[PDB]
């Protein structure tokens, strides 16, 4: 179970990432609605 | 009692993943909204 922890650790960081470029996009979409 | 850590630590990553992936199957539905209300 630690190679998988250590594992699935990794793959929720990027989750974060993922999640992260995500609602930066929505924002940018959101700029573009005003201008 | 390392043994049973490993175990509880391994079962809460995979509550934070579904946690992540529920999350993400929001924003993706979010980036549909937007684009359409854009577009």
Avoid: P
């Avoid at chain 1, 998988?4 to 989750?15: A, H, T, Y």
């Avoid at chain 2, 809460?12 to 209300?37: A, F, W």
Wanted: glycine fraction near 2%; aromatic fraction near 0%.
């Amino acid at each position: 179970e630690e190679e998988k922890s250590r594992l699935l650790e990794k793959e929720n960081r990027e989750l974060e990432k993922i999640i992260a470029e995500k609602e930066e996009r929505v924002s940018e979409l959101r700029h573009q609605l005003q201008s | 009692s390392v043994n049973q850590a490993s175990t509880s630590r391994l079962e809460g990553l995979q509550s934070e993943n579904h946690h992540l992936r529920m999350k993400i199957t929001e924003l993706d539905k979010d980036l549909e909204e937007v684009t359409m209300q854009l577009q």
